[PDB]
Amino acid sequence: KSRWDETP
Amino acid sequence: PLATQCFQLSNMFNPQTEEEVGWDTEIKDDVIEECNKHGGVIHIYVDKNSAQGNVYVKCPSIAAAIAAVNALHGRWFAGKMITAAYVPLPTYHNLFPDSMTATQLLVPSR
Amino acid sequence: VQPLATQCFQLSNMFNPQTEEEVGWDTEIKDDVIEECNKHGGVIHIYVDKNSAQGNVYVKCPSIAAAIAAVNALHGRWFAGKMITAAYVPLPTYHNLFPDSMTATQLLVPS
Ligand SMILES: N[C@@H](CCCC[NH3+])C(=O)O
Ligand SMILES: [Cl-]
Ligand SMILES: [K+]
């Protein structure tokens, strides 16, 4: 579960 | 703009990110995982001493690096918009001489 | 918790470089986005990143109200089965990516 595409 | 085997990701972390154990391994694994949906990756350096959140990457061909850069530039990571910039090959080899002989494709930490 | 509106945003899914077949496609997008912005609050800077795998277009509008109107007109359209999506970009992040956009304050309204 990567932090890619994690919005602020 | 000059495509090469090497690039620099920015805005990938900040100094507060560094307050958790293993923060840089999480970032390295995330970069590796994404590169392995494209052309892989043979060298990676998370610059803990950059306030700007820089990660340096070398891929096994220019085609592999382009595929990664075009997938990653403008992408959001950990709540911030990431930028990717190509690094000239001699610049990368001068900065990171150990990357010259790296040839094994990287995989995520266990 | 959605990010607040800013003057700057990034549209995604506006194109797919692997499959774009029309000569001049990326300038057509730029001019068409400018035209749409000019039915709303206008636009002061725009960059179509023709190599972006996710189809990114970067836009700076003269005010946050203008950006909201542009975002609301452009996002929610469907291209090749994907929704045009908009994400606001913090001003310092946008200015670092596009240094010429910092001192731009006049509207791109074709003469
Ligand atoms: N306020 C917008 C129109 C959008 C409102 C209706 N969805 C403009 O600049 O014209
Ligand atoms: Cl950001
Ligand atoms: K709409």
Within 13 Å and on the Cβ side, how many CA atoms surround B73? 23
Our count of domains for chain B comes to 1
- b/e code B39-75 from CB counts within 10 Å (16+ = b): bbbbbbbbbeebeebbbbbbbbebebbbbbbbbbbbb
- The Cα–Cα gap between B23 and B16 comes to 10
Q: What are the pocket residues of ligand 1 if the criterion is a CB atom closer than 6 Å to any ligand atom? A: C 40-41, 69, 72
Query: What values do phi and psi take at C48, rounded to 5?
Result: -95, 115
Kindly identify which residue of chain A lies nearest to residue C3, measuring between CA atoms.
Answer: A8
Contact between C96 and B80 using a beta-carbon 8 Å cutoff: no
- CB atoms within 5 A of ion ligand 3 belong to C 76
Structure-token match 């293993």, residue found:
B22
Query: What values do phi and psi take at C101, rounded to 5?
Result: -70, -15
Nearest-CA residue for atom 10 of ligand 1: C40
Task: Answer yes or no: are the C-beta atoms of C91 and C102 closer than 8 Å.
Answer: no
Distance from CA of A6 to the nearest CA of B (A): 5
Displacement of CA B38 from its chain's centroid (Å): 13
- Structural method: X-ray
| CA dihedral of C89, C73, C47, B32, whole degrees rounded to 10 | 50
Neighbours of chain A (3+ CB pairs under 8 A): B, C
> Which of the listed residues C35, C36, C72 should we mutate to test ligand 1's pocket, taking the one with most ligand atoms within 8 A of CB?
C72
**CATH number of the structural domain spanning residue B55:** 3.30.70.330
What type of residue is B15? P
> Three-state DSSP class for C95?
helix
- Residue C100's domain comprises 1-111
- The Cα–Cα gap between C60 and C27 comes to 17
